[model samples]
Target: NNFITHNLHTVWIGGPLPDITKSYLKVWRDINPDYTHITWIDTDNKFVALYNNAVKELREYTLKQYLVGDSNATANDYYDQAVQIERGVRENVYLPHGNDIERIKTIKKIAGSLGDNKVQEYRTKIETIESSFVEMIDGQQGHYQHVSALFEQFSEMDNLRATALKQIYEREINDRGNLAAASDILRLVALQTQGGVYIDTDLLPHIDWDLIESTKLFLMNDNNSVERVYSKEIYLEIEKYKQLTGSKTNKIRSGLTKSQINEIQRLTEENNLFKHLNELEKNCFYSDNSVRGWTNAMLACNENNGFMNALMDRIILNYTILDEFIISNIVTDGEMLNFTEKMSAQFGLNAEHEGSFIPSLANYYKDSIVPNSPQATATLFMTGPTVLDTVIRVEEAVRRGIVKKEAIASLYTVEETFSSQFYDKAAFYLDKVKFDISLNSAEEGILRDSCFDVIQQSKEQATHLPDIAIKFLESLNNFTWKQLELLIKASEFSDQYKTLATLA
Candidate 1:
């Protein structure tokens, strides 16, 4: 009997999804009509559990850093640096003359090597210059504006850097606590309680998902399958460029032709854009997992399975009382046999008590223990893929009757069973189309010819344009007019050029 429920679960926290997200949802629904699609939104009862005043300091810190003060005064490193600059001006630049005069007076009084007249002359000259310097420092009259202008520029640059940092913070950590952590917990709880395929919103269907069996737990291999073709294309382009320009032994010199440089610049820009394209693909197209890591994004499990049961129990326990350091230890030192026992000793919960888990609707709330450093995302460790990965590793070890092994190779290979078979059959990558339009590739020529063909065919009769050709045009949206003109060759399209010229 297939234990897995025919339910597809997804989470969207803020509100109604955008058309692009909904467009993919429609495609998924059309493909897997049999499965019940559940989009968990705000009104959904299930959510991340936290104390009322848990992130009080965090919120204040974020507010001060991003929102308040003169260019984020309370938290701006640039402001602090500017303060240092101002201090330097006040002490060193502004008071230098007064301090120098005092030093010279002290020297004159201490040593009578020179006559009184000489001393008087030196003192009189020093006093006169000191008065002039003080007056000049008080009011900026001439070239002082140059100094003021430079300071103004420095001040403006400081504001720019602060503003940039603020924007980056907003974009990256908008909903600091909730984004990844809440979604991760929401998806797991959905599967644990209801039994379904917890597919991420972006993980759209390629083939009919009904064909894939879900009798047991299944997780996709997180290999770089999506970027595989692109990586190969990039490698080929590099080799081709090397062959054309010069090899590693014989470098392309400064005396290289302008035509070659244009070609090289185009190649560089295309490759950089392709990297951005790959990131877009990773976020928008597929559920990316790790190398040997299974994705929590596309987890499929039966209701009340031992694995899910154990996972939820641990998550609840972790959120309830265990600190982040302990939780981190669970991830790192999970494979050890006495690891659970050791963990129990730290928090004073016995091994037997720790193992006990029961299902209840009562949500557990705990203070926000994990705070994100500049490096790692704290929430991910709290309730994301990393936790799931650890649970899976430990659970597998426990099920297989395997204990601590001295050598990695000594561990027994996992036996083929119904559960593992389900994973093998269900886990698959999606269909994707990649473009290769570098500076001097056949694809560039093809794109140009294809655009011409499309225009001509449309002019002749209303013809059906291929999807690939449409995608080619859609990708050109990022191109400037000059780039587009170069791509399609403005000279070739005389009538189109005339229409644009008339408009201009």
Candidate 2:
């Protein structure tokens, strides 16, 4: 029997509950009084806490190696060092800098020259080697620093410890956490372990939970908005440049001049390049024109369902791989960060779906400092709906035997997505709820917040009323000038009211 557990799970993280969210919670109870509604707060679950602790321990342990240094460097350490330098030279020098002719020539010249004494001698006098190849390795000197620093910490460990630690550190300690990611992960673990319907707090209950018979369910989000914004050809051109230059959206500015970057931003805004590039590339799994992809916002599944298990495993693997790159400090030709999309392209998973161009470049260049937090959008691929969609599509292919066993690793770049495919074949349902509530369900509350903020900012910044605000205020039904006057004087918003205003 395909049965969805009656429990409805939602999460709240990083702050006090919003009054609007509180109201929506009440609505859920009012409408689905028979269904169990659970609003999970930060301390309500142990999954995220456990995951956090695991990461914290791994991080502390890895960083401890930094303090211990290479005082105990052994023969293994020396060999590791020599091998690392050789690999770095091939990667940073022959590959990136050398022509095919030069690379072939250089490889032969440097071949077998890196014996123990040469390694030892070159260790003290790297400046000499660096000087001769200064032109070839202009921006590549960091290769040595990276190797030295890495070996400095890890040189003492033997093969087994080094391998295990590298594996553990790469997956566990490399995560970049945020409230959104935590919430999404909490939803996965919560729903997976407990077996229930996971809904977002902002979602108002319109559908009767008792009606769903499917063991697995994911909500349908429309793709028209995304389709309206992304231009595949333009995005492809930018992607080519990004790949050629080895730039993520944030680091694209590193290579371009201010003028060139600004023009790209201008082109981005014109084409509406603010959406996820992965989504743009994703082939629509749905036959329906309105449905874009299955959303993670509201999901339903029985306890220990294969799909949920796969999703949980997928999340862990995706986050681990992504964060390793983030923490690795190694830059690659955009292929590393865009692994999901690149893999999808390679395996022909989603050839059609795309955009991130503005805030990152502008903020970085203007501030002359890295931002203290990752932009909220990072979670979309990491733990968000995009990740869920990949699992479903990939698992579906695996079931169909369209995907080869060996290609699974390259397809998902994750261990779980490949293995979990066997159990992930449960029949799934898509909930079609009306209202683009994704934008915000409480429009009245949003409008009030917007107007109140505009009014307060007008006074605080000593700025005049924006012309659109005056026109918009006057255009509303039953609106009056007196209400606007009262709001401007007090710079406050009441529980509920109507208003009209003038700049004068």
Candidate 3:
């Protein structure tokens, strides 16, 4: 059974009343002339009868008062209605009920003074009224508890109203400094009202249509779990000193060298060596990988050894390192991988062989190995000839106006001066030949002979009209006069050139 209960009731009674005692009694008689038939009399037997009778008459009279005051009601008419309802009850019901109870208690206190008969009657009445009233009060208390429980549940289910009210109260009480603070507070209030559920609006549109059509709720392969699994696989492979031997075999092979094993070991210790290898391996092994043959020609021994050697020379001259030989050798060997076996034969190894050797050595020295040459590892594949590809590409871009001439010129200056040591050695040679014909002097002859050797070696090195040399010449011709003067000074040109204040 479902029932609705009104559990809240409060009374407010105050102020004066008119002397209508008889009239009020008459009204009471009209409402409940036979009060004895009323079954419920939980408290104040006589007062309960009086209260019922009075309410019936009062309700009727109050309605009449409201009707008479509706059209052209004066202040007197309004006052009369209020007095009949509010004041009449205050005087007759609440006041009399309280007074009678107090009178009965007073009589009980004077039990010794009063006649036995009178005292006994008052005592019995007071006991009956008090007992009955206590029972009624207990019932009312239970009803209030029920109402409290219902409100508690409602508050739990619908928090939006409560949260908004709380936010309003807080705003009134606390001072939020600026619009941003106010906005933040409001946003928080909104989130709280929404019960902390957030939806990604940006990602909602891209949800898979197939998944949406197939199921009520979408499900995808657990990407987080998949990533974790891949990470574990990679970790395990690295821990076991196992090379990732897949389609990346060739790419990995290209990066393999005598020093790679030590580097791999060192990197493994630092927990990052495999990452670099992985990138390199991906480039070489994956056929469709964008970088597959990108470094192939540059590092390939059979491709062109002279090209590789020139590339290695450029790299070494540009950068200073302890293991210049290894740096120079790798670039020489790798770049010529595609030309002829003899070209890259200096390394005494080929890509496939070197590649196989690297992993084998890595496995052999997987633990407790520190690379003697870290810089060598960095410069291993970076040689003068190795940079030829980059230079040629830049030159092509400049000629096609894809790049500015000035930009290309800047690159050329750096590339030529570093790669050929042209400013230092070439200038020294020019000075020695022009100023002193001293074949016996150590500094003079040594500089001259070294310059001669370099020039001769450059010719031998330029067996083919490679793009690198051609671009280098183009850059040299376009060099500014001031730049040329610095170049000459840097090369230790003749004193005559140095003495010219214009050149300086």
Show how many residue pairs clash in every candidate, following the order shown: 0, 5, 32
Q: Write the per-residue lDDT of candidate 1 for residues 47-114, one digit (tens) a residue.
A: 11111112232232333333224331221343233233333322343222122333343334422333
For residues 4-46, write the lDDT of model 3, one tens digit per residue: 1111111101101112211222222233333211111112222
Q: What is the TM-score of each candidate against the true structure?
A: 0.35, 0.36, 0.14
Task: Report RMSD (Å) for each prediction in the order shown.
Answer: 27.4, 25.5, 47.8
lDDT of 2 by residue, 256-326 (tens): 23444454445434533222101111111211112345566666555545565556665655534444444
Model 2 residue 469 lDDT? 40
lDDT values of the candidates? Answer: 0.37, 0.37, 0.28
Using lDDT as the measure, name the better of candidate 1 and candidate 2: 2
TM-score of 3: 0.14
Model 3 stretches astray by more than 4 angstroms: 1-410, 413-443, 451-496, 500-504
